[PDB]
Amino acid sequence: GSELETAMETLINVFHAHSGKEGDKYKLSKKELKELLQTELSGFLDAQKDVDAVDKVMKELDENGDGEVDFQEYVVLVAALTVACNNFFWENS
Amino acid sequence: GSELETAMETLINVFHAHSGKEGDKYKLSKKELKELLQTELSGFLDAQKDVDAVDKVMKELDENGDGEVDFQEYVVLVAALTVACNNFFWENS
Numbered sequence: 001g002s003e004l005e006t007a008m009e010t011l012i013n014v015f016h017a018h019s020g021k022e023g024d025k026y027k028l029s030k031k032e033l034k035e036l037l038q039t040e041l042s043g044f045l046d047a048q049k050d051v052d053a054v055d056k057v058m059k060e061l062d063e064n065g066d067g068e069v070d071f072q073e074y075v076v077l078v079a080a081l082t083v084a085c086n087n088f089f090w091e092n093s
Numbered sequence: 094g095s096e097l098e099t100a101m102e103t104l105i106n107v108f109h110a111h112s113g114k115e116g117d118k119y120k121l122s123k124k125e126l127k128e129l130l131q132t133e134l135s136g137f138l139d140a141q142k143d144v145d146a147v148d149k150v151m152k153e154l155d156e157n158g159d160g161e162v163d164f165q166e167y168v169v170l171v172a173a174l175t176v177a178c179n180n181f182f183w184e185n186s
């Protein structure tokens with residue numbers, strides 16, 4: 001209904017798209033996230049330029065420490081990136 | 094561009110819509126958030142049914158403790174609610 005909900009549904013749809021598309025529906029693996037960020041985000045992952053950047057990114061996300069990235073971990077990634085994004089736009093950093 | 098980005102932009106647009114519409118552009122107050130959640134979310138805030146629910150909700154959000162809700166606080170609210178939402182759909186809770 002509301003646009004905010006549309007956004008929330010979008011996050012659900014993309015997470016489900018990848019977690020659902022491969023492996024466990026509610027768990028995201030290195031290979032899979034590597035695909036989801038590239039398919040959805042370009043500049044964010046691309047900015048690192050490093051090939052091991054994906055590995056570096058996922059280690060931080062695995063608060064859980066199970067070697068996998070979880071929907072909650074992913075959720076904070078997009079949200080924190082969202083606030084950081086607006087900050088980048090208005091603010092230099 | 095990508096749908097995920099569209100969602101991120103939507104979160105930015107709604108936060109900015111309210112924080113920007115009233116008071117400080119980067120700070121959300123009780124009165125204002127009361128308006129943003131109702132305008133964007135219905136069932137989430139409505140479910141509490143209590144009138145003081147807004148107050149109860151904001152206290153948790155003010156990690157900062159400044160009596161205001163910040164974009165980052167709001168960001169985690171929608172994100173955590175997003176994962177909790179999908180959980181509600183697939184899962185009973």
Ligand SMILES: *SCC[C@H](N)C(=O)O
Nearest residue numbers: 043084085086088089
């Ligand atoms: S987070 C904002 C990033 C910007 N639109 C860009 O990368 O072009």
Ligand SMILES: *SCC[C@H](N)C(=O)O
Nearest residue numbers: 136177178179181182
């Ligand atoms: S978080 C999912 C909530 C559901 N769509 C509803 O409230 O109807």
Ligand SMILES: [Ca+2]
Nearest residue numbers: 019022023024
């Ligand atoms: Ca998966």
Ligand SMILES: [Ca+2]
Nearest residue numbers: 064065066068
């Ligand atoms: Ca994990």
Ligand SMILES: [Ca+2]
Nearest residue numbers: 112115116117
């Ligand atoms: Ca404001």
Ligand SMILES: [Ca+2]
Nearest residue numbers: 157158159161
């Ligand atoms: Ca605060």
